[PDB]
Amino acid sequence: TQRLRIAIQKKGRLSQECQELLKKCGVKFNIMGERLVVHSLNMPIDLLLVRDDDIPGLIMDGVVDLGFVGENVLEETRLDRLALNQRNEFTTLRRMDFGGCRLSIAIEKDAEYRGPQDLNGKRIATTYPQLLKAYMDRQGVDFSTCMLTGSVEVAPRAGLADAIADLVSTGATLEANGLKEVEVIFESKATLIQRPGAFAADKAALIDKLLTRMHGVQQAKESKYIMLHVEKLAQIKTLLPGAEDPTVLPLVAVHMVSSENLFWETMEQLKALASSILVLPIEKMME
Amino acid sequence: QTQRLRIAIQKKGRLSQECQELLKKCGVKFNIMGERLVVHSLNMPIDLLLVRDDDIPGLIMDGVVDLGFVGENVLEETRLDRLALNQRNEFTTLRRMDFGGCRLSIAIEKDAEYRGPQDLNGKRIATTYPQLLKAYMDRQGVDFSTCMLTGSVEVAPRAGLADAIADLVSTGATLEANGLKEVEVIFESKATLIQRPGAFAADKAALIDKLLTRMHGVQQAKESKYIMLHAPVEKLAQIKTLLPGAEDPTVAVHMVSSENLFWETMEQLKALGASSILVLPIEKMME
Amino acid sequence: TQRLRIAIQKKGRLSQECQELLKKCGVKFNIMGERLVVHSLNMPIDLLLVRDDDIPGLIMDGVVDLGFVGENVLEETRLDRLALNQRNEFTTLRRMDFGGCRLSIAIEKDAEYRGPQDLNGKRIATTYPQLLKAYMDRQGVDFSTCMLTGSVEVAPRAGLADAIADLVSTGATLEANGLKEVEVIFESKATLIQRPGAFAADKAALIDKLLTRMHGVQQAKESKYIMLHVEKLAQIKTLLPAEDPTVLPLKSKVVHMVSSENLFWETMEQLKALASSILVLPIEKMME
Amino acid sequence: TQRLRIAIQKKGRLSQECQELLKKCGVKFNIMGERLVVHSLNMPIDLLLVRDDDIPGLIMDGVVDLGFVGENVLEETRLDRLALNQRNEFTTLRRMDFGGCRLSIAIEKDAEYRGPQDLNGKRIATTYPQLLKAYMDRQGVDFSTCMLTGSVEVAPRAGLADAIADLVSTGATLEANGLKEVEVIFESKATLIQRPGAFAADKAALIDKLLTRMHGVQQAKESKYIMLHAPVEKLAQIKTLLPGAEDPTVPLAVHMVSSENLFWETMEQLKALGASSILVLPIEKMME
Amino acid sequence: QRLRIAIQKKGRLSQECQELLKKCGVKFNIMGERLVVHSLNMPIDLLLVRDDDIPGLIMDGVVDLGFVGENVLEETRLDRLALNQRNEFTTLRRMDFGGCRLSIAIEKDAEYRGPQDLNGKRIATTYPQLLKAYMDRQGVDFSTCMLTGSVEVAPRAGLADAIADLVSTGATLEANGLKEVEVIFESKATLIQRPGAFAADKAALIDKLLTRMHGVQQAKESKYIMLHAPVEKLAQIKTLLPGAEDPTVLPLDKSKVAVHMVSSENLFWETMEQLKALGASSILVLPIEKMME
Amino acid sequence: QRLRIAIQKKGRLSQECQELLKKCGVKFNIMGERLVVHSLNMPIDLLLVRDDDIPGLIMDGVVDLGFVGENVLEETRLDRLALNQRNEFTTLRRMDFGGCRLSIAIEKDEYRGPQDLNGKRIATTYPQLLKAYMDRQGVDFSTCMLTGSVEVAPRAGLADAIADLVSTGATLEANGLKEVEVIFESKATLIQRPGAFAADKAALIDKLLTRMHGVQQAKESKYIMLHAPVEKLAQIKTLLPGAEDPTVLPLSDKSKVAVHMVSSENLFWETMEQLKALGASSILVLPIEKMM
């Protein structure tokens, strides 16, 4: 009567990473190419392959149960809706470790920027007018907008705007168009959100199972099994944060699980205190 | 000291290449330097702006560019979205292109009955072109709900999001893939060349006029052909009828057609007893 | 079936060139990707996108009306069938100017070959055992076979056979595997064949229309409009071969005419040796 | 002085997975482009990159020593050969954990199938006529065949046959062409077979070394080092949930090696018994 | 014994050279990374070599003809004149391809009124000889920094005040904080011949090939033009197109006449617009595949 | 002021060098064809230069460290010693990548050994390394210096033989030649400009080197767990001279014991087979991501 409906961006780098995570969590399915409803083989789950821009909208209107989407698109649509008294409520279940990107202010290379107040009175081009307003209201700076749905980087050289606010990762497009990033106003990752309202306890249990699995996939990526050699224990313990007590062994030899990746800096700190520092990977876990 | 003529063309898409091709066939020289979105003409006082197609009517309507290449569908949808918010919406149409053809069509599920528009009365319809859909349904006097999606419209029926859809179509591939059939053409679009409203410096006026006359000539050369054939003298008046064109045939008949010869026309000519039908191309012309 | 059914190889260089020719002849259709029956929008025609290997078989069993296929696959299947008294009759409508390739005998680079008789008693690997037999029987030379359905070029170095008979265009694979082409046994192009038996006169008329159009597409590719500059006219006429040249008005000068073949440099040079202001214009479309 | 000759499919899914396994077993070699005989650098082994369809043929004619091939192609060729009294004997050394796929009967979507008997008298298209016959004889149902070398999915919509028997995984091709899978007739994996007859004891020892290593490569894929905390209550139950060879070692803490992959379901079972800090470490290489 | 022709093995210059030999009716197929290539239908061998070695090979008589950038030719001529090595050759024809330009570039945030602003600055280049030729001609002293590539590194790295590189996009310059400020050499590809005497057969062959290349160029440039003009305007139209043969004229009533003729250049729009202005009509331009005066 | 490192701009050698700096915790992103690259998290500049210029730059002190083929380093050292130019530098570490070999090749159709080259003309892009080789074999030859497409020379009648870089024989077979003699086997190397550093910059190079050592040691090393008879333990220890002292745990019973330890090399199958032969069982090898 009702399977769990999950909205994923149809095509994009964000799509593969979302499909990959559902599969790493033991959700089996095949995309029957260009068909946009995908039925899970082994679980009572439907995938809807939609434009990312529509996903907050769908989640907010209860029309799907779960949704994978950029924090940037989500917050922009929430604000566009709050501006029209449209329902804008949802529950955030988990932040992904992917889809990273940032909304940044950019100006022409040949231009001085001491801070946000240097934009007071200038026109700014953006595809994220709401997130730009939120930032400039917070900095108390007045500006004009120039709304373009893309090719934002055109606007300054084209005499359309004094500056822009765009998504950025590399800065290739910026250099190409005579611009430099000068201010991060929003840092986004993908996020997994849930429609508002009540859930059948079966469907509740399913989402809980899925989430616990996602937690495990992340914890295995991050965590590491560390073995080292003597008798300077408590300081070493502090230098390697983790959940459980380290087991201390025979000839001292310490075995334990880090919660974070071991960095070179940390390894170097340990030699400065320790010897035979090993880090083994962890394929799978559940605390 | 003066602002160059600024022309907006879609940055990336089918429509982009065909527009760049035509400016070059009209003797406008320019080279695209990668992801740079302002392009300066080498030999003419012209700038190109490589923007999203959806923003072009917007730009033209706000006078911020001079000329714009855009789908008749995007243009009419944005004119209506704007008239609904008392925003500018005025522009002048210079010329319809012989490219960018496509149609907005209503589609429903394959195994479902459609006698005519009235069968949609009260159904919810998903579309990226809410205004053009409204225009059509008001003309047919049928009431319906909308469901706005920014893309992947074809998802909506199978997903239980809407009873039907209104999408761009050519082949039907996406429709068949998603369990739908086109049942009703509501808008037929080609690309068009529009001009911002208001006054033009007579230099810039003269330039647009030169460009238009050249565009006419590049189209006339595509359409026109030099034809040479042998016929029975008796069949002359009939042959004349079969080949519409501007000038009289010379004497063996030599002449220039205004339309492309189809096979069917050539077969008609052999039937009149004409022989050695040649069609030579015309690279360039000006009546 | 009441629509004309045409078999085309599904995917391959041969596929594009076949679709292209049907479209140049005014047959409109869209491949709805991975769907293997394609219905024409504007003509009573179905396309079946099948393996090339099955097309002679389908044409011979009347199950399709027309078929585009390599002359090599066609003749091999005809012979495999004649060997099992299976129906192997069909009608060839036209040879294509595409799908060119050749079955060639290849041996190891460091090996001597004075002619076919140097293969007498040797084992030969091929995916075309029938065409190989036809060749060797014609040369009266006895040999063993080693049948492999591909990667034929492996056989000598692998000690499977003394030589091979493979399709060739470049010879990349041959050099890579230590071999040289030494003898062309079969030259193939694609060909358009028709099932045997009777046709409804409507369906007959349709195939005839299509063929006349294909003839015109080819004739326009080959032909050229030539204009040049009084004695030696009859000789010039001979040098440029299907109509009288119209004799120019402007003595010192003159000539306008249509060649049936491409003008080659050699021919142009011959003309200067006799002529001046030699022009060649293309012909987009024609019907003699 | 003849090296051990191993046949692997030249190009396909099955190729990479076979090359990968030879390398994981310490056979070094480099593919030099379109070259089809590949010599091992460090072992007395040649690889032959041939069409998969020819591999059972080669193994059965003793012309190669070992062969990697789909169980489906192998059984079809054994039967096609037994039907022509050609040599069809070989020895199966080991079944691979890759190349999974299944031959399935498919019919048109909007058509009823209660079971095999619904096919009695229908024509069926397939590239695997023998495996289809084997299945239908077992179910005692009579049918016609329509042999196609590929694009089988065309046949029903094209009016060439009532149903088909094709390889299937997702169903994409089937949906695209108006068909539904309704009956699995053969489940295949890749398999490693040996030519029949005697082996020199050196070459025997080498195949045995290779097999023992393959066993170890598989055992390392399957096996995992698991570390967890549990109540001493529910220990015997935990033992049952993690099958392996050795007893688990046990301050708190259980260390052991599983013989199977831990699934999420099993990990969830363990948390339910009240176990905590469940780790699974990979094993690159092993030998019991 | 055959005609030996050197062409750059791989590069934009390679395709355009192979294309031209084929358009001239020389048949051959490249079998991958095979570098000595025989023509099927003509007594001609192709050598696929590095562009930098081609002037060298032609100058040492080891090949007969060579396709190469004017820039690498002049750089090697000078490198050789500096070592009293043979630097003599004959130039047969300038190509209408292989365009590129050696330019001086300096840091964006720096003042440059002209070449004299380089006096005493260090300059990086892959073309040390052409750089010297330029600086001698402007009478300016400078230091060099020779690098075989990645020239654009030098200024940002504090290796050099300026650079002289091949320049095309501008992207690399902007990326590295530089601006082109001065063109020192504009190159096209050229076809050169080894020095010495030729067997008259081999002479005749090169002459045939050259005449064919002339024809391929003349067909690119030329157009068959058909128009209507007032008979009074004909002589004037003739004057406006010095690129023309004498037109064949036919009457149509007697006001206008129909003119058919071959231009030597393409008609620009501007010229076509000039013709409408004289009161000509129905100006058509047909392409020409192949031709020979 | 900051540490300047030269790496080949584009080539297989480039990726492997960038990869190693990142595996050593140096953060940076290449913004297209920008050639001076600043590290985000360390006082380190990267220069993306042509490989041929790297020895030159290191030798002229203009950069601090340089990643480069042993072959181009030795060729430029010799080109320079021939012009009394400074050719001094310090070698920090040999890489386990950038393998390739300069080989002599002649026409397929007689070569008994190097003396068969006496008096023949030879084409190469490495004229110095060719001279070094021929001097070492005491053989005289003519040269033909070309910057590339060396394999042309014999078929073209320019030269009797060639000396080229080789990996596959493809180009050789294509052009009617056979490799007959390896004259130089190269790997990439990490070299340092000559002179004094400043103890900050000294400390940094030392940190980087120790990290590179650790990345290599983790590639090579393995955590091995096995069962053996207690009697066989000392013998097993001997068989793995690559080992730490094993932690040994008794089972259940006292017959077999369980041994956990770290090899310095990977275990070959052959070694694992040797261990089963001593009557060890349940030989497991786990990977090691990182170590020190």
Ligand SMILES: Nc1ncnc2c1ncn2[C@@H]1O[C@H](COP(=O)(O)OP(=O)(O)OP(=O)(O)O)[C@@H](O)[C@H]1O
């Ligand atoms: N088959 C087709 N489907 C869609 N648009 C088509 C088609 N054929 C022509 N067009 C034309 O292309 C125009 C824009 O094409 P394009 O594919 O760039 O659109 P888009 O995907 O909406 O782009 P954008 O990134 O601006 O949203 C349409 O407005 C229409 O006029």
Ligand SMILES: Nc1ncnc2c1ncn2[C@@H]1O[C@H](COP(=O)(O)OP(=O)(O)OP(=O)(O)O)[C@@H](O)[C@H]1O
């Ligand atoms: N989804 C799949 N569909 C078909 N075969 C599969 C699939 N997955 C695995 N296989 C296996 O791969 C084997 C051969 O793979 P491949 O795709 O190269 O075959 P092929 O295209 O029939 O090859 P050939 O060129 O020899 O005709 C099959 O016989 C089967 O055992």
Ligand SMILES: O=P(O)(O)OC[C@H]1O[C@H](OP(=O)(O)OP(=O)(O)O)[C@H](O)[C@@H]1O
């Ligand atoms: O079915 P065809 O005639 O081949 O046309 C393909 C259709 O698919 C696209 O729209 P769609 O809304 O499906 O794409 P989206 O994922 O961008 O929303 C495109 O705009 C075409 O209309």
Ligand SMILES: O=P(O)(O)OC[C@H]1O[C@H](OP(=O)(O)OP(=O)(O)O)[C@H](O)[C@@H]1O
């Ligand atoms: O349906 P899926 O599980 O996605 O499997 C893909 C299908 O593609 C192949 O058939 P195809 O129609 O391509 O036949 P051909 O190889 O002869 O063209 C293969 O036999 C599979 O059945």
Ligand SMILES: [Mg+2]
């Ligand atoms: Mg759009």
Ligand SMILES: [Mg+2]
């Ligand atoms: Mg197969």
